[PDB]
């Protein structure tokens, strides 16, 4: 387990509140205040998730040890709903839970670049309190794709050998304001921002 | 990587053909024979897929920290179409595949205890030349509960507790015919017995 986590004492899962000021916490803010300066942020949370983080950290190797010194590794927005986050915080991504997408590349779990997007209430939708949630996610994109409506797993990087894939898709491969996801454990959860307007 | 794994010449995925007559083959040749003798075996290979097996050991040392106790992994059967097989082989089991058999007891993948259930054609399905495959898999079946249409995950241990989840579901909780499972690397796709009626 990273060594920059709080001890959690034999506890397998714990939200962490970061504090202005701090460069970890300030970073995020930044990330988040680039495309959505309307907001104001509530809290910054960092999920220690055991669990999530080692079946993610052995994927991250895998897709590391089969691209070709690819930057596998993005760090992407998912706006989410309440009744959602108790779930996402202990279990992570769940593609047989995702809405369908108002423009759909795929059935999978969906991640937008820029906050702004995940900002939209059709995403992080105001709980009975006006509080949004959006997770920051380390999301592996690794070799990508345009994707298409019909998907359930990434296409096939060549047609006439089918189980050899493309590790995600997106909207655009020349610039990319959305990836999707198709499997267990290829998202880690790793902040959790509540804000008002 | 397991000890009765052959060399692998640095690679990370081979189908190894098990030689007839020896302890292995015999092994998993009697555990289908047990409901099946009316079959014919043409061959019965080991799966060697370094990542799957990675991934599921990850996830069997995570259920046995869970659960408290190391009785989490059941051997079940699969039978599919030969279209299916270099999917199951590479990837192992996907719920979002199966758009063809009944999903009665929950949306994941399905499991028989008994080889003659998966030999039926609706499962693994004959090809030009009578050819059926089943697999033998390793499941992490963990603590299970009975299943109803519609599930997505396993159902809540408590609702009290709404994130504490069952590993897997079944039909029959006293005398399980048939196991449940709504996560990829739940499953280790262990042998593949190619044969006919
Ligand atoms: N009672 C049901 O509706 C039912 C659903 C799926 C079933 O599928 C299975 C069950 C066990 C194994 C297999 C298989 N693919 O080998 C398929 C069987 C019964």
Request: with cysteine.
């Amino acid at each position: 387990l990273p060594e920059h986590w709080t001890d959690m004492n034999h506890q397998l899962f714990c939200m962490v509140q970061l504090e202005p000021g701090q460069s970890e916490y300030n970073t995020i803010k930044d990330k988040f205040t680039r495309t959505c300066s309307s907001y104001a942020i509530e809290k910054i949370e960092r999920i220690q998730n055991a669990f999530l983080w080692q079946s993610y950290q052995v994927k991250k190797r895998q897709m590391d040890i089969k691209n070709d010194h690819k930057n596998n590794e993005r760090l992407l927005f998912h706006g989410t709903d309440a009744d959602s986050v108790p779930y996402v915080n202990q279990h992570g991504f769940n593609r047989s839970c995702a809405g369908k997408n108002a423009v759909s590349y795929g059935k999978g779990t969906y991640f937008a670049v820029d906050a702004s997007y995940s900002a939209k209430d059709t995403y992080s939708k105001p709980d009975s309190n006006g509080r949004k949630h959006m997770y920051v996610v380390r999301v592996l994109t690794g070799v990508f794709t345009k994707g298409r409506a019909g998907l359930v797993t990434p296409p096939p990087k060549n047609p006439h050998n089918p189980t050899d894939l493309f590790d995600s898709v997106t909207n655009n491969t020349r610039s990319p304001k959305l990836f999707v996801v198709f499997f267990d454990n290829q998202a880690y959860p790793e902040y959790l921002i509540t804000f008002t307007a």
